[PDB]
Amino acid sequence: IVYKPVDLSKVTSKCGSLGNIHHKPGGGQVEVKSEKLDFKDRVQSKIGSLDNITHVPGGGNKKIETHKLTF
Amino acid sequence: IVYKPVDLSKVTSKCGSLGNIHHKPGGGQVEVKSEKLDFKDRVQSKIGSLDNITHVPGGGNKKIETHKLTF
Amino acid sequence: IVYKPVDLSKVTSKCGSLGNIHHKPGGGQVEVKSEKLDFKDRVQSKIGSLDNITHVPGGGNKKIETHKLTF
Amino acid sequence: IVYKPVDLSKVTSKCGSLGNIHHKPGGGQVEVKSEKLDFKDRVQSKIGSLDNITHVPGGGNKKIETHKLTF
Amino acid sequence: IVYKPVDLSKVTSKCGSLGNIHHKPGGGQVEVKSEKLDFKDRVQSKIGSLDNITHVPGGGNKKIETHKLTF
Amino acid sequence: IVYKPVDLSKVTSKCGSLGNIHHKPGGGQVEVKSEKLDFKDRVQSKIGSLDNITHVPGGGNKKIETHKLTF
């Protein structure tokens, strides 16, 4: 005759760099000489003293719920 | 005649670098020479003193629930 | 005639570097020569002094629940 | 007192599809259904009945020669 | 006192599909279904009935020669 | 007092499918199902009825020669 589903729950996802301290995380010196090169097809290149990434394609949630009462 | 499902639960994910201290994580010096090279096909390259990554394609949750009452 | 499912649960996942202290983790000096090379073939290359990764494609949870009452 | 280098040589490269006959090289039927996809990072896709390629990043020549006469 | 180097030589490379007959090389029927997929990172895909490649990053020649006459 | 180096040589390379007859090499019928997949990681996929490749990163020659006459 009576029902009362009580949901007080918590769903949580904490993803990537969080709550951190980085103190003096210095990238060093970088040098890239290059002489008499040929590249007769596609190239991609990346050069850097410091790189720092949080990517996080994940971290997703789904909460799914159902009720019925039937005579 | 009566029911009261109570959910007080917690669902939690904590993913990638978190709560950390990184103190003076210095990248060292890097040097690249390169002479008279032929590349005749697809290339990719990456040169750097310090790199820091958190990736996290994961860390996800799913919470699924159902009730029924039938006469 | 009466029922009261009580769920007080915690579902927890903690993944990748966490709560750590990294103190002076300095990378080495790096030097790369290269002369008269042919790459008639696909290349991918990576050069660097210090490289810190937390990957985590995992770390996920799922929590599935059901009740029924039938006369 | 006298010299006469005679070079009547031939340097030849023949590279990729050449002198061939292709008779009725039919691509077949292709079908690509797709439903309720998510792509939450970079994609590249290729679909086709027939694909025919000559790539040839190579096939090159070099001819190097030197003389001297000295008292 | 006298010299006459004679080079009548031939240097030859013949690379990839050549002089061939391909008669009725028909690709067959292809079907792809795909339902409810998640991709959460880099993807690539290639679908096709008939594919025909000649690549040849090689096939190259080099011919190198030298003379000297010294008193 | 006199010399006459005579080179009548042939340097020859023949690489990949050549002089062949391929008669009715028909690709078979292909069908792909896929349901409810997760890809939380790097994918590369390839689907096809008939695929024909000649690759040849090699097949190259080098011919090196020298003379000298000295009093």
From Swiss-Prot, chains A, B, C, D, E, F:
Tissue: Expressed in neurons. Isoform PNS-tau is expressed in the peripheral nervous system while the others are expressed in the central nervous system.
Residues where N6-acetyllysine is found: 4, 10, 14, 24, 36, 40, 62
Residue numbers bearing the Omega-N-methylarginine modification: 42
Quaternary structure (record): Interacts with MARK1, MARK2, MARK3 and MARK4. Interacts with PSMC2 through SQSTM1. Interacts with SQSTM1 when polyubiquitinated. Interacts with FKBP4. Binds to CSNK1D. Interacts with SGK1. Interacts with PIN1. Interacts with LRRK2. Interacts with LRP1, leading to endocytosis; this interaction is reduced in the presence of LRPAP1/RAP.
Function: Promotes microtubule assembly and stability, and might be involved in the establishment and maintenance of neuronal polarity. The C-terminus binds axonal microtubules while the N-terminus binds neural plasma membrane components, suggesting that tau functions as a linker protein between both. Axonal polarity is predetermined by TAU/MAPT localization (in the neuronal cell) in the domain of the cell body defined by the centrosome. The short isoforms allow plasticity of the cytoskeleton whereas the longer isoforms may preferentially play a role in its stabilization.
Domain notes: The tau/MAP repeat binds to tubulin. Type I isoforms contain 3 repeats while type II isoforms contain 4 repeats.
Protein name: Microtubule-associated protein tau
UniProt gene name: MAPT
Residues of the full protein shown: 625 to 695 of 758
